[PDB]
Design a protein around this ligand. Structure first.
Ligand SMILES: Nc1ncnc2c1c(I)cn2[C@@H]1O[C@H](CO)[C@@H](O)[C@H]1O
Length: 289
């Protein structure tokens, strides 16, 4: 349709001219060597049929750029994490986790692996909207098809991959240079869940002579940190989740129902109600508007 573009939030704020609804506009130089935005558009369209991703409204030229126009959502879990003094309660982590296992299952069901799990990439809905309490997944810049579309077969196992990604959440097998698969998306979520609960991960803050060596140093520490220690003083289901996903084979389909039951059983046993009343409920949320 017809859109106008505003200030930076390259991501910009924009407006649908006929509805006067705000939107987000991602921009890539039209003269780019290595254009990637069209590829990310492709992924969002593959995933269109769920309400856990932003809607995309347009891909094409806005001037000296190509533009992808998408639904404007709320703050990221990292934004909200900061708001809540960098810890989340169990109830809030569980509501997040149950949603994101389902979200990740849906991405996997559409033949894609995500490969960029981090709290910055999960957003609540826009304050005041119907889906304001839902958690959404964004940014498929690192995503990849794990099922070849002609052969209908899973991508081959491969080693010595070079590391791109947020070192903090990545799976141990990713650290090792292995081709990422479904398992790795779920392990990374697990690391993020512990991050939320603990306030931090014990391999945060590590520094090295290079970024390559920082990845290695962080991987060493993940390998040297037993799940029993990492999840010490937190429910066993957290460790149960982590052990399960750490043991998954490269080609293995995860039992998403099982992992979800771990958490939904604990949620109920804990006496929690799925009210979408998060730690950040009632707090004034940031907006570009
Ligand atoms: N569609 C959207 N609606 C609202 N905000 C958005 C998006 C998208 I795509 C990204 N963001 C914000 O930009 C930060 C960097 O990805 C993210 O951490 C996030 O806060």
């Amino acid at each position: 349709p017809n859109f106008r573009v505003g200030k930076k939030i390259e991501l910009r704020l924009g407006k649908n001219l006929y509805t006067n609804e705000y939107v987000a506009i991602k921009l890539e130089p039209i003269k780019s060597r290595a254009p990637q935005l069209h590829l990310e558009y492709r992924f969002y369209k593959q995933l269109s049929a769920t309400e856990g991703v932003p809607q995309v409204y347009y891909f094409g030229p806005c001037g000296k750029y190509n533009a992808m126009v998408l639904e404007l959502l709320g703050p990221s879990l990292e934004d909200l994490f900061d708001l809540c003094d960098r810890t989340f309660t169990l109830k809030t982590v569980l509501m997040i986790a149950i949603q994101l296992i389902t979200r990740m299952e849906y991405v996997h069901t559409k033949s894609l692996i995500y490969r960029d799990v981090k709290p910055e990439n999960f957003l609540v809905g826009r304050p005041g909207t119907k889906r304001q309490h839902a958690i959404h997944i964004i940014d498929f810049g690192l995503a990849k098809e794990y099922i070849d579309p002609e052969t209908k077969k899973h991508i081959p196992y491969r080693e010595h991959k070079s590391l791109t990604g947020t070192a903090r959440y990545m799976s141990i097998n990713t650290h090792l240079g292995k081709e990422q698969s479904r398992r790795d998306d779920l392990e990374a979520l697990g690391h993020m869940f512990m991050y939320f609960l603990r306030g931090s991960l014990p391999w945060q803050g590590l520094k090295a002579d290079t970024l390559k060596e920082r990845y290695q140093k962080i991987g060493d520490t993940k390998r040297a940190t037993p799940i029993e220690v990492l999840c010490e003083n937190f429910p066993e289901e957290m460790a149960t989740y982590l052990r399960y996903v750490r043991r998954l084979d490269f080609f293995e389909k995860p039992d998403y129902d099982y992992l979800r039951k771990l958490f939904t059983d604990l949620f109920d046993r804990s006496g929690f109600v799925f009210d979408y009343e998060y730690d950040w409920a009632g707090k004034p949320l940031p907006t570009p508007i």
